[PDB]
A paper describes a structure:
Uninterrupted RNA duplexes longer than a few hundred base pairs are recognized in the cytosol by the innate immune receptor [name] (melanoma differentiation-associated gene-5; Kato et al., 2006, Kato et al., 2008). The helicase consists of two RecA-like domains, Hel1 and Hel2, and an insert domain, Hel2i, all of which form contacts with phosphate and ribose moieties of both RNA strands.
Helical reconstruction of the filaments formed with 1 mM AMPPNP in RELION produced three maps with an overall resolution better than 4 Å (3.68–3.93 Å). The maps had distinct helical twists of 74°, 87°, and 91°, respectively, but similar rises (43–45 Å). The low-twist structures (71°–81°) contain 14 bp of [name] in the asymmetric unit and density for nucleotide in the ATP-binding site. The CTD forms stronger RNA contacts in the Twist74 structure than in the Twist91 structure (849 Å2 versus 471 Å2 contact areas), whereas the opposite is true for the Hel2i domain (293 Å2 versus 321 Å2). The CTD capping loop (residues 944–953), so called because it binds to RNA blunt ends in RIG-I and LGP2 (Li et al., 2009, Pippig et al., 2009, Wang et al., 2010), is disordered in the Twist87 and Twist91 structures and in the [name]-[name] crystal structures but partially ordered in the Twist74 structure, in which it forms contacts with the RNA backbone at the minor groove, as had been predicted (Uchikawa et al., 2016). For example, the C-terminal tail forms contacts two helical turns further down the second pincer helix in the Twist74 structure than in the Twist91 structure, and the Hel1 interface loop adopts a different conformation in Twist74 than in the other cryo-EM and crystal structures.
Residue numbers in the entry: 307 to 474, 479 to 643, 668 to 949, 954 to 1020
Write the structure that this text describes.
RNA sequence: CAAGCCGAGGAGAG
RNA sequence: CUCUCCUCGGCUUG
């Protein structure tokens, strides 16, 4: 391992106590300075006959294996014992015991918190911080309100204040936070920015920040920025299609008699549709809620039309209505006035919309703009042409990947492309799996795919190869994502583009984040040059305030929903105001999954075979007689006992009918009994 | 590989 | 404070 000139000075105070933060730019060898500090700490604690254990904390799963393979093990295999832990191994089970060996631990975080609270809640073995001598951290800037890793530090600070009251002493460990930039936390002034930086430093018990300032030229030579760049377009033709949908929506409303006080093709209208649906369901009146459920789909179609082709919206709708027709046929294998009206309104115009959509006379601007942007680079760079795209949604990524596969020009220039999204199981899309992600990364590194389409997955964590033409298509989150993307593009003649529309304030937000970036550095300078006594005074005040802001939050949120009422309810279907279950019939397995095993509920539903699995069904999707999907099948002890949700159902209390929607099971106060086979059997 | 439970952060709009 | 979008983590059934 090598010791750069400028990494030295930033690391230097850490080597003798002095818990600190380190903010360097991106690509400056952050992991490697971590490694060096580790080796020093351990060699030191050996030379003094003192036990030395370092633990690395990360936020993601892949960075653990990552750092185990590339940085820590290749250099410290020979002197010390290393390991890498996560939620995707089997070493989680005896975590108190791996500590008894393996002087270098890498870990996902909440492993640790689980073990601490197990030591402090049950009679398990567990662990405390006293069994360490260093905590290294990646991505400092997540240390904010009740995240994970701040429990850790609130406990560290609690014990530190115990030590300080003792002084007027357990040996507490050392802490070394590493980041790219701690970030201004949503503050409209330089002073509140300062306050936020100090809040971070208190939540890490720091002594300084240690930005590089002296050996700066070596950085500028070894490390460089891309060039910021904007590309803007404007559109007022909307020629056949938009109005062809606004007509439909207007017709539906004037069939429903609901006045939005708002516009078509935006986000407030959506919120109205939601609360109207929820109200109609709490009341029970149809003709309003199902229509709302469709209007939401139309609004989504218009929003994606603002960014994506008409054909993608037409397809989105085709999928929706095709599914609904299949549902009604599976049920009927009756035809209310509502659904009949809606279908008759849609399918008559289906062929028209298909004709209007395929019309290259007016496709879109931003797509053409990025066409020009992309072709410029891949004509310039010629087989060293890596590429990245950022967008907001997942469906957009599928659409863009499809298009770049379809249009000949992009394939001509060697533009081999793949999509990428996250593994969260929500949001009406089939997510990806970690394996597909890692494979795509290795394909990018290999060179199979020249450009990647991504959501906010790409701006942090996983280690993509250095790039050229990072762009930004309809996304401005905050300064952090801005800088982290801005730190991808090495490989000279790099850029950082932003592609937006005219009448949607985005360049606004881009500029705001630029000013925030320029502000946090001023605040860093304000605090590094702060006097030590005043700095100490302020961090002590903030640590006290943070620990007091925990206690209160603890006092008002012990349970907040505790009234356990076994069967005081009835669960109805939300589409059709129809009985489905009572609360007594329901039970729980492994105190997590809710389920019912009475034959009355058995006969009411229908199973529609899986499209997720076709990409032999194992987990059927339930539907009603009406058509509203309810749940999913489940296999407990071979019993195909069918699970369910509480997002599609409605509640009716027996007393006075404040019917409510909950969106998930924990929110409601009442408790349900555990399962046991004594019922239906014996 | 599929299903689901809980928690957390960020951003928009209101 | 609510809704939507996005990401992440831990945990269970198969
Ligand atoms: N001190 C060092 N000496 C030699 N090579 C280094 C050093 N630090 C980093 N490298 C090289 O830089 C690459 C890994 O470091 P780097 O690119 O900073 O990854 P990183 O830690 O993820 N940067 P970042 O994305 O900001 O966290 C490899 O090609 C290493 O060979
Ligand atoms: Zn129903």
């Amino acid at each position: 391992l090598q010791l750069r000139p400028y990494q030295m000075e930033v690391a230097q105070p850490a080597l003798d106590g002095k818990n600190i933060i380190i903010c360097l730019p991106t690509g400056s060898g952050k992991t490697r300075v971590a490694v060096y500090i580790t080796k020093d700490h351990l060699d030191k604690k050996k030379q003094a006959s003192e036990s030395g254990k370092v633990i690395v904390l990360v936020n993601k799963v892949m960075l653990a294996e990552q750092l185990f393979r590339k940085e820590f093990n290749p250099y410290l295999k020979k002197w010390y014992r290393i390991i890498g832990l996560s939620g995707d191994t089997q070493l989680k089970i005896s975590f108190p015991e791996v500590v008894k060996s393996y002087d270098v631990i890498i870990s996902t975080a909440q492993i640790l918190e689980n073990s601490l609270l197990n030591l402090e809640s049950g009679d398990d073995d567990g662990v405390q911080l006293s069994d360490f001598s260093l905590i290294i951290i990646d991505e400092c800037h997540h240390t904010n309100k009740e995240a994970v890793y701040n429990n850790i530090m609130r406990r560290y600070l609690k014990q530190k204040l115990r030590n300080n009251d003792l002084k007027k002493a357990i040996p507490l460990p050392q802490i070394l936070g590493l980041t790219a930039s701690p970030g201004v936390g949503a503050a409209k002034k330089q002073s509140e920015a300062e306050k936020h930086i100090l809040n971070i430093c208190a939540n890490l018990d720091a002594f300084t920040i240690k930005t590089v300032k002296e050996n700066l030229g070596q950085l500028k030579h070894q490390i460089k920025e891309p060039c910021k760049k904007f590309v803007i377009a404007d559109d007022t033709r909307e020629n056949p299609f938009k109005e062809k949908l606004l007509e439909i929506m207007a017709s539906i409303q004037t069939y429903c008699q609901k006045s939005p006080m708002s516009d078509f093709g935006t986000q407030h209208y959506e919120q109205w549709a939601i609360q109207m649906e929820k109200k109609a369901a709490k009341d029970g009146n149809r003709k309003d809620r199902v229509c709302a459920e469709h209007l939401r789909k139309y609004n989504e179609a218009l929003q994606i039309n603002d960014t994506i082709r008409m054909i993608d919206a037409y397809s989105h709708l085709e999928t929706f209505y095709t599914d609904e027709k299949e549902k009604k046929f599976a049920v009927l294998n009756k035809l209310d006035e509502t659904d009949e009206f809606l279908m008759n309104l849609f399918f008559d115009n289906k062929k028209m919309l298909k004709k209007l959509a395929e019309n290259p006379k007016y496709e879109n601007e931003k797509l053409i703009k990025l066409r020009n942007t992309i072709l410029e680079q891949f004509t310039r760079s010629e087989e060293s042409s890596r590429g990245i795209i950022f967008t907001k949604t997942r469906q957009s990524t599928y659409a863009l990947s499809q298009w770049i596969m379809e249009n000949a020009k992009f394939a001509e220039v060697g533009v081999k492309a793949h999509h990428l999204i996250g593994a969260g199981h929500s949001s009406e899309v089939k997510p990806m799996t970690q394996t597909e992600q890692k494979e795509v990364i290795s394909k990018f590194r290999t060179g199979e795919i020249n450009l990647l389409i991504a959501t906010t997955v790409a701006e942090e964590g996983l280690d993509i190869k250095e790039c050229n033409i990072v762009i930004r298509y309809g996304l401005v989150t905050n300064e952090i994502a801005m800088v982290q993307a801005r730190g991808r593009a090495r490989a000279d003649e790099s850029t950082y583009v932003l592609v937006t529309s005219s009448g949607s304030g985005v360049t606004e937000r881009e500029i705001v984040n630029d000013f925030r970036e320029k502000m946090m550095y001023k605040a860093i300078n304000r605090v590094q040059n702060m006097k030590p006594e005043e700095y100490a005074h302020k961090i002590l005040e903030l640590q006290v305030q943070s620990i007091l802001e925990k206690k209160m939050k603890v006092k008002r949120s012990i349970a907040k929903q505790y009234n356990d009422n076994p069967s005081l309810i009835t669960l109805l279907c939300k589409n059709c105001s129809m009985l489905v279950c009572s609360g007594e019939n329901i039970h729980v397995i492994e105190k997590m999954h809710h389920v019912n095993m009475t034959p009355e509920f058995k006969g009411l539903y229908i199973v529609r075979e899986n499209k997720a699995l076709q990409k032999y069904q194992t987990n059927g999707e339930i539907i009603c007689k009406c058509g509203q999907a309810w749940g999913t099948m489940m296999v407990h002890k071979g019993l195909d006992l069918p699970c369910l949700k509480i997002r599609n159902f409605v509640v009716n209390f027996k007393n006075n009918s404040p019917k409510k929607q909950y969106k998930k099971w924990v929110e409601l106060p009442i408790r349900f009994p555990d399962l046991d086979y004594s019922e239906y059997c014996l």
